[PDB]
Amino acid sequence: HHMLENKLGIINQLELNRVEERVSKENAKRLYDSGDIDRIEVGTFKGLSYIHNYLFEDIYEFAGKVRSQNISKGNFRFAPVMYLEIALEHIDKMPQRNLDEIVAKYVEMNIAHPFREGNGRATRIWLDLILKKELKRVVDWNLINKEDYLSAMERSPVKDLEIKYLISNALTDKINDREIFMKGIDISYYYEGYTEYNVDEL
Amino acid sequence: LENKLGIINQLELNRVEERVSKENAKRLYDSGDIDRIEVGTFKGLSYIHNYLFEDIYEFAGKVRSQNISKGNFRFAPVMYLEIALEHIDKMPQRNLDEIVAKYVEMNIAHPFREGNGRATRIWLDLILKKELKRVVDWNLINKEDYLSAMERSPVKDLEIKYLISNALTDKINDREIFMKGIDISYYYEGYTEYNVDEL
Amino acid sequence: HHMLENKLGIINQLELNRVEERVSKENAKRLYDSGDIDRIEVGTFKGLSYIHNYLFEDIYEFAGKVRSQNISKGNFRFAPVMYLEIALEHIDKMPQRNLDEIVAKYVEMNIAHPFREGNGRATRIWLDLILKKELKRVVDWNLINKEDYLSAMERSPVKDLEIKYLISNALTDKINDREIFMKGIDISYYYEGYTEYNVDEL
Amino acid sequence: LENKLGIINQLELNRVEERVSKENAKRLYDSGDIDRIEVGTFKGLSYIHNYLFEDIYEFAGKVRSQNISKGNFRFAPVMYLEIALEHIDKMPQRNLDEIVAKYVEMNIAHPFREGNGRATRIWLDLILKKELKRVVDWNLINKEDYLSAMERSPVKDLEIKYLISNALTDKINDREIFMKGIDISYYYEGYTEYNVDEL
């Protein structure tokens, strides 16, 4: 599902990590600077899919499309492909009127993990848009320490108090501030282990 | 938990639930209704569960609408609980292995808001009796061994198969085994006040 | 380590559960009504040991003494016997000046799990005494739902935010109120799966 | 993390740490100091760690005083970290099995406040070279396979033994293998900005 491996024959793990950061962070910058970020359906798998394909169209095969394989990160098991579609339809109709609802919906979408890869980054953009539209806030992701966030996300299916704490104490009303967006892209990628570039410099 | 008896204190609700529900278990068996239930489907499990809990909970026999977990495990998300139940229904149950795998799947499903383990072990005995003419002498299974095997069961089900296999008896119409099974099964879940056959 | 099994030949699991609740809850009532509860060293393994033996002297072999076997509840692994003594000495010198310190010390003592059995109940009495002495508060344990508490305790070694939330929102300044104590004994035992008796009726 | 360079932003600290520490790794190897370290003790590991991190952290080479965890696993509690280190020191290291068991134990220990996985993989290569005249061609081990095996290692260490065994090479004095190992080992931990041999 790595198009660069398939076509370009770049097979080394670190270098493919870096090329994926390069290309997809450039796409993310384009997403914001075009205003495309704010012209897409909010809180729906259609919106998540638009985002995923915007970032990864050249990078992951079938970007923006539901995966066809079961995936899991360690002990954390994501929705079986079997049930993905129905579950996503079920996520579409979840409400998003306050922070509690929005957090619960973000958590269900994380469990769903609809893509083979790129779920974290794309779903964090999805989430920030939901918060913008519904609460007129976004997350200042630089305030949320990487390890705290990853632990909170892994705990969120049993109890979402941790992720709720982090998210609520990192909300700002700087909803269209370019630095918040660009910094959050750098932080979001750093969560996943890409640290080479600043999105601003692409 | 919202209950139709207006209980607020969690321990009083625990004891009220034990009293009411174990009495309905005794009735389920003595009336013979237990022998008139579809075996191995969520339809039968729902019947069992409503039978035990209708008096005390409005959510009895119904697929839950909230997500629930126990410790570090989240049961089948509401996103796909129902479709998962539809697929557990089609699971074969021809030998002890397939039956225990089906039981482990239904336990991961945990379809009700409350009362899952107890209703589901009654369910499992129904499957075992229909297909192997055995049931589980639950008194032979220590609570810690059973809870440990169940926690391990989503990743390896071999221990829960061991325990169940070694507690099976062909005394499938023995009332003492059933009532003692009810008390032990409630004891797994932390209900110890009552002896069912004394209700 | 079940003396009733060893001497009385009561071997059935449910009945031994019930007899242990009967005898040890009666001891717990004695603990409070004698005032013995408030004449013991606070926040030390010596105090925890006094409590454990007060409750379980007739019930568990070598009550109040450190275990000689490795134990674990499921995926949760407690300090190896190997390291128990040193660890307990290390727990003795932990500070207890605010709720954060007290919670962290309670968590380390839960990981330690110094006894073969009876750790939860005895350590909750230990904890309530620390809170009484240092903050002039105790926990109203009936406000803390069993499943919330057990999840929080299992999560406490990675992140103690959950158990801290529960404990802090269930503090009361009714530090010598008999109903708080007796109810908390009933609730504490119910956490562990003993529900037959009210301690007040013994 | 309090660092002596006054960094506040977590990602800038990540990059500063990569730059400084990988440079000290290059120096550790090029100077030959890496061949003058006690092999298989916390003394040697502490030396490695201070060598990498003294410039950036005050806690370099020191046994941590805070507890730390990663996701759902808590590393060896401060209650008994030191005594646990004393016992890991006495672990034999005569074959690949005993060495990997020792490495898994030291990883559970996670003795430093930060920098454990990287310093400890350098440590492990030292043990492997001294005892088997092999090292790990880390480029042959995919990050996901390695992290997965390490998460599983406290309960079953057979997968981490598999991966390590199948990545071993007798090229124990090959600088390209070492520098590439440094980059891959930092990449496991989420540091990808720099190539060490270009520092």
- Within 13 A of B135's CA, how many CA atoms are on the CB side? 21
Name, in order, each residue with C-beta under 8 angstroms of D120's C-beta and a sequence gap of 6 or more: D45, D103, D106, D107
Residues of C in contact with D83 (CB under 8 A): 82-83, 86
Residues of D in contact with A147 (CB under 8 A): 70
- DSSP H/E element including B55: none
Nearest by Cα to C146 from C183, C193, C113, C112? C193
CB atoms within 10 A of CB C1: 17
Largest interatomic CA distance in chain C = 47
Query: What residues pair up with A72 in beta bridges, in sequence order?
Result: A77
Q: Tell me which chain A residue has its CA closest to the CA of residue C148.
A: A159
Nearest by Cα to C120 from C129, C111, C131? C111
Chain A contact present for C5, CB below 8 A: no
Chain A contact present for D15, CB below 8 A: yes
Contacts 24+ apart (CB under 8 A), C67-70: C67/C113, C67/C114, C67/C115, C67/C116, C68/C116, C69/C116
Residue type, A74: G
**Cβ-nearest to C195 among B11, B143, B147:** B11
CB C158 within 8 A of CB C193: no
| CB pair distance less than 8 Å for D69 and A193 | no
Looking up tokens 């890991």 gives: D88
Please give the tally of structural domains in chain C: 1
| CB pair distance less than 8 Å for C161 and A158 | no
Nearest by Cα to B111 from B146, B73, B81? B81
| CB pair distance less than 8 Å for D73 and C111 | no
Rounded-to-integer distance, Cα A38 and Cα D31, Å: 54
Rounded-to-integer distance, Cα A179 and Cα C52, Å: 58
Residues of A in contact with D15 (CB under 8 A): 195
Can you list the positions of beta strands (E) in B60-142? 69-70, 73-74, 135-136
Query: What residues pair up with C73 in beta bridges, in sequence order?
Result: C76
| CB pair distance less than 8 Å for C150 and B71 | yes
Query: What residues pair up with B135 in beta bridges, in sequence order?
Result: B169
Residues in chain C: 202
Rounded-to-integer distance, Cα A65 and Cα A70, Å: 14
CB C14 within 8 A of CB B184: yes
The CATH number for A47's domain is 1.10.3290.10
Rounded-to-integer distance, Cα B188 and Cα C158, Å: 27
| CB pair distance less than 8 Å for A158 and B87 | no
Q: At D113, give phi and psi (nearest 5°).
A: -65, -35
| CB pair distance less than 8 Å for A86 and B73 | no
Q: Tell me which chain D residue has its CA closest to the CA of residue C92.
A: D79
Largest interatomic CA distance in chain B = 44
Mutate to test the interface with D, among A10, A11, A12, A14 (most CBs of D within 10 A): A14
Q: Tell me which chain D residue has its CA closest to the CA of residue A185.
A: D11
CB C110 within 8 A of CB C82: no
Helix (H, G, I), strand (E, B) or coil at B195: coil
> Experimental technique used?
X-ray
Nearest by Cα to B63 from B40, B36, B38, B86? B86
**Cβ-nearest to B190 among C75, C154, C195:** C195
Q: Which chains touch B (3 or more CB pairs under 8 A)?
A: A, C
Query: What residues pair up with C76 in beta bridges, in sequence order?
Result: C73
CB atoms within 10 A of CB B58: 11
Beta-carbon contacts below 8 Å between C and D:
36
CA D169, D172, D178, D181 torsion: positive or negative? Answer: positive
CB A158 within 8 A of CB C158: no
What is the CA A148 to chain-centroid distance, rounded?
Answer: 17
Span between the terminal Cα atoms of chain A, in Å: 25
Rounded-to-integer distance, Cα C155 and Cα C162, Å: 7
| CB pair distance less than 8 Å for C162 and A159 | yes
Name, in order, each residue with C-beta under 8 angstroms of D86's C-beta and a sequence gap of 6 or more: none
| CB pair distance less than 8 Å for D191 and A195 | yes
3-state secondary structure chain A: CEHHHHHHCCCCHHHHHHHHHHHHHHHHHHHHHCCHHHCCCCCCHHHHHHHHHHHHCCCECCCCCCCCCCCEECCEECCCHHHHHHHHHHHHCCCCCCHHHHHHHHHHHHHHCCCCCCHHHHHHHHHHHHHHHHHCCEECHHHCCHHHHHHHHHHCCCCCHHHHHHHHCCEECCCCCHHHHHHHHHHHHHHCCCCCCCHHHC
Concatenating the DSSP letter of every residue in B130-193 gives: HHHS-EE-GGGS-HHHHHHHHHHTTT--HHHHHHHHHTEES-TT-HHHHHHHHHHHHHHTT--S
Burial of C58 (0-12, 13-18, 19+ CB in 10 A): middle
Residue C105, min C-alpha distance to chain D (Å): 11
Q: Tell me which chain A residue has its CA closest to the CA of residue C163.
A: A161
Rounded-to-integer distance, Cα D171 and Cα D180, Å: 13
Resolution in A: 2.3
| CB pair distance less than 8 Å for C146 and B10 | yes
Looking up tokens 């570039």 gives: A197
Looking up tokens 């003394």 gives: D43
Residue C117, min C-alpha distance to chain A (Å): 27
Residues of B in contact with A91 (CB under 8 A): 79
Q: What are the b/e assignments for D60-76, b being 16+ CB within 10 Å?
A: bbeebeebbebbbbbbb
3-state secondary structure A57-85: CCCECCCCCCCCCCCEECCEECCCHHHHH
CB C190 within 8 A of CB B11: yes
Full domain range(s) for residue A116: 1-202
Burial of C152 (0-12, 13-18, 19+ CB in 10 A): buried
3-state secondary structure chain D: CCCCCCCCCHHHHHHHHHHHHHHHHHHHHHCCHHHHCCCCCHHHHHHHHHHHHCCCCCCCCCCCCCCCEECCEECCCCCCHHHHHHHHHCCCCCCHHHHHHHHHHHHHHCCCCCCHHHHHHHHHHHHHHHHHCCEECHHHCCHHHHHHHHHHCCCCCHHHHHHHHHCEECCCCCHHHHHHHHHHHHHHCCCCCCCHHHC
Helix (H, G, I), strand (E, B) or coil at B10: helix
Rounded-to-integer distance, Cα B172 and Cα C11, Å: 25
Rounded-to-integer distance, Cα A109 and Cα A103, Å: 10
Please state whether beta strands D69-70 and C171-172 pair in parallel, antiparallel, or not at all (unpaired): unpaired
Mutate to test the interface with C, among A155, A156, A166, A167 (most CBs of C within 10 A): A155
3-state secondary structure chain C: CEHHHHHHCCCCHHHHHHHHHHHHHHHHHHHHHCCHHHCCCCCCHHHHHHHHHHHHCCCECCCCCCCCCCCEECCEECCCHHHHHHHHHHHHCCCCCCHHHHHHHHHHHHHHCCCCCCHHHHHHHHHHHHHHHHHCCEECHHHCCHHHHHHHHHHCCCCCHHHHHHHHCCEECCCCCHHHHHHHHHHHHHHCCCCCCCHHHC
Mutate to test the interface with D, among C75, C83, C101 (most CBs of D within 10 A): C83
Residues of B in contact with C188 (CB under 8 A): none
Nearest by Cα to C52 from C96, C117, C104? C117
CA distances A156 to A79, A149, B112, D145, D160, Å, are: 15, 10, 21, 24, 28
Chain D contact present for A186, CB below 8 A: yes
Which structure tokens are listed for D55?
A: 């410039």
Q: At what angle do helices C146-155 and C178-191 cross, to 10 degrees?
A: 70
Burial of B173 (0-12, 13-18, 19+ CB in 10 A): exposed
Looking up tokens 């089906």 gives: B102
Those of residues 150-179 in C touching chain A at CB distance below 8 A are 151-152, 155, 158-159, 161-162, 165
Rounded-to-integer distance, Cα A81 and Cα B137, Å: 38
Residue B193, min C-alpha distance to chain C (Å): 4
Name, in order, each residue with C-beta under 8 angstroms of D36's C-beta and a sequence gap of 6 or more: none
| CB pair distance less than 8 Å for A13 and D151 | no
Residues of C in contact with B18 (CB under 8 A): 195
CA distances D87 to A122, A170, D83, D109, D114, Å, are: 45, 43, 6, 11, 21
- DSSP H/E element including B111: none
Name, in order, each residue with C-beta under 8 angstroms of C20's C-beta and a sequence gap of 6 or more: C2, C4, C59, C194
